[PDB]
Amino acid sequence: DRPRFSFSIAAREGKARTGTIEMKRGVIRTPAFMPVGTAATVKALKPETVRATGADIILGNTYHLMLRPGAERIAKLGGLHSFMGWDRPILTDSGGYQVMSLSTKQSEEGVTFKSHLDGSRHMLSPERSIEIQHLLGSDIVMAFDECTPYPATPSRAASSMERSMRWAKRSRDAFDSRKEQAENAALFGIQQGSVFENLRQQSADALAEIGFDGYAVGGLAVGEGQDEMFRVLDFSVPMLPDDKPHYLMGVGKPDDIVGAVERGIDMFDCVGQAFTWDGPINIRNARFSEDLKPLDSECHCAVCQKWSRAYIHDLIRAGEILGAMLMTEHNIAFYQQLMQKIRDSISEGRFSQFAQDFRARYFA
Amino acid sequence: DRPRFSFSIAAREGKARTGTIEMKRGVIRTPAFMPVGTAATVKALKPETVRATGADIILGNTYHLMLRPGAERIAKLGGLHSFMGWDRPILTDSGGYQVMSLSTKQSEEGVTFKSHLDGSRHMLSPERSIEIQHLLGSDIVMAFDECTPYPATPSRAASSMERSMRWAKRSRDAFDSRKEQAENAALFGIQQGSVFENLRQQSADALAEIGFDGYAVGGLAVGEGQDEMFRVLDFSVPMLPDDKPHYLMGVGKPDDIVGAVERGIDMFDCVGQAFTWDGPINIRNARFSEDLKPLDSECHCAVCQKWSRAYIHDLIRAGEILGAMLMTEHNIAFYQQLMQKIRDSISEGRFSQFAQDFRARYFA
Ligand SMILES: [Zn+2]
Ligand SMILES: [Zn+2]
């Protein structure tokens, strides 16, 4: 019988690590990329299709799910695994980021907001967020925090980091209050502090004192640019407990991922562009109209086995759902192949060379 | 090696027949229902999915294909079978019906029209329609005719029937002029004549004198209502050659199909509604919101194995493409199961009883 949660590091190179997270619903190979299963084109894909790319775990957006069709409904009707037809681990976010980006009255208690769909009124808080994630039945639950915009003044960055740490303790206690959740799921805390080294340190200290199963670096991929993001990761990741997973939320492009692994990150997610080893292409571009090759000539995915650039170009320009599904399937597969190459190269002690080789070709 | 075209009747009951059409690309069991493969939700389905429902042949709409991405492009790039990923027979229509319904200047030579997509100018004629269908590479080619609206005066019905027969001879000669098409594909002629028995007779006589591989009953499912349609089929079908397939274009609902088979028809096509043995339901209706049963409790399809009415209700109301795909897959599967029950009951000499039993439950 598998444990509730066990993270084992099998190999290291510099700050990079490769390993496994064992959970009751399955094993997650790290570094891991989590497709966002609650995307329309993603759910249009068979769960089997998503699994066949190599995904070990997918993400669900709590904000979208609570709004449509609702958490209590998902629960009464079987839970999110049944809803997604996905029997392996699922990570849910707290819902708070989409409140800020898509929907508000904020207070120390939580946030109230109006649905972007029907103007109905809704509430999130550390306690309600954890409750909804319990109702969904997810395996990895994110603490509910308060986002900091970029740029942010030091005073604001500090206030939102401090509130986030208070809310991290509330999230921990809410999670621990439900037997079924505490015994079967895992809880991740989120470090805040914007670009400020001392705030990041205070945040890491607070989260480690509370204790979580894994630690996300929050507050990045919000406008800062890759150099700044990498600079913040350089000092922030080593502040987190070494023996637990490190999750960079909302990152990102292939080169972001590679640089973030070089800095100690273990888990990633993000939502006409197709990825190739020679860089992204926009398939709508007229230069692909007579291009008979697949999206990427080394890609092993089912799309690249069967369909040309020329055909996918036509579908996407015509706005056909087949086009969007084919692009999404290939892109998910490309990301899983990237993660596999990363894991192999770290295990084999040649990840530095891999990162160099990857960049040379991807930016050529 | 399979013949270009062979229709064999294995069993009869009254005017109903069951049998097979053998073509180079495969066997078609009759009575047959042809899904329209050029539909967005239909093409979003795997070809394997469509095949797994039992479909032996699919239809392509020449009007849509010539407009986007174009016949010459489909040809240069591999042909419609490659384009659809479907290696079994494909029937294409002539394109003329959608010109009348979607796009005009008509003459004895053919029609010119403006694309409903970009205002570009296009032309169809018996010769150009046959040429485009050759470029697509379809297995069953429809003669290009002139549609008669409903209702139509006798004079108009006669003029359009007579023009259609002239155009049937032109279609025959164009088809016969291309070796690759004549040796490998089949050509169907279309009977016209509206609701008038004498015009239908003249039309059947003209088409039989020219000679085709199969004969469609045209000009129905255009507003007349089922009783009138059935009345026209009662006298029209027996006018056609008995030893060749009879195709009712654009029909239709399950009960239309059953009554049309009782009158001698062998082939059908048509484009929130789900079909069940207990009649159609609209899954969006609030009464299905807590309904945990599948769309139909006897249906063998992959959708009904896995998904509830309650869930599909949510998807369709939210406008999710997964919803439309699940509904389409189940509906295609339902139609193939209907056709299978029809074929079995005719072979077994109990089709009359089947039709009675079907109607009793479907309209209960
Ligand atoms: Zn691919
Ligand atoms: Zn079904």
Swiss-Prot record, chains A, B:
Q: What are its GO biological-process terms?
A: queuosine biosynthetic process; tRNA wobble guanine modification; tRNA-guanine transglycosylation
Annotated stretches, region: RNA binding: 250-256
Sorted alphabetically, the keyword list is: Glycosyltransferase, Metal-binding, Queuosine biosynthesis, Transferase, tRNA processing, Zinc
A Pfam family: TGT
- The question of whether Metal-binding is a record keyword is answered with yes
What Enzyme Commission number(s) appear in the record? 2.4.2.29
- Per the annotation, how and in what number is the cofactor bound? Binds 1 zinc ion per subunit.
The UniProt catalytic activity note for this protein reads: 7-aminomethyl-7-carbaguanine + guanosine(34) in tRNA = 7-aminomethyl-7-carbaguanosine(34) in tRNA + guanine
UniProt KW Cell wall biogenesis/degradation keyword: no
Instruction: Output the SUPFAM superfamilies linked to this UniProt entry.
Output: tRNA-guanine transglycosylase
What is one cellular component GO term in this UniProt entry? cytosol
- Residues annotated to bind Zn(2+): C299, C301, C304, H330
| InterPro entries the UniProt entry points to | ArchSynthase1/Queuine_TRR, TGT, TGT-like_sf, tRNA_ribo_trans-like
Source organism, top-level taxon: Bacteria
**Pathway listed:** tRNA modification; tRNA-queuosine biosynthesis
Cofactor(s) needed by this chain:
Zn(2+)
Q: Which residues bind substrate per the record?
A: D93, S94, G95, G96, Y97, D145, Q192, G219
Q: Which HAMAP family match?
A: Q_tRNA_Tgt (MF_00168)
Question: What does the subunit comment say?
Answer: Homodimer. Within each dimer, one monomer is responsible for RNA recognition and catalysis, while the other monomer binds to the replacement base PreQ1.
Function in brief: Catalyzes the base-exchange of a guanine (G) residue with the queuine precursor 7-aminomethyl-7-deazaguanine (PreQ1) at position 34 (anticodon wobble position) in tRNAs with GU(N) anticodons (tRNA-Asp, -Asn, -His and -Tyr). Catalysis occurs through a double-displacement mechanism. The nucleophile active site attacks the C1' of nucleotide 34 to detach the guanine base from the RNA, forming a covalent enzyme-RNA intermediate. The proton acceptor active site deprotonates the incoming PreQ1, allowing a nucleophilic attack on the C1' of the ribose to form the product.
Q: Which family does it belong to?
A: Belongs to the queuine tRNA-ribosyltransferase family.
The protein's name is: Queuine tRNA-ribosyltransferase
Question: What is the species listed in this Swiss-Prot or TrEMBL entry?
Answer: Zymomonas mobilis subsp. mobilis (strain ATCC 31821 / ZM4 / CP4)
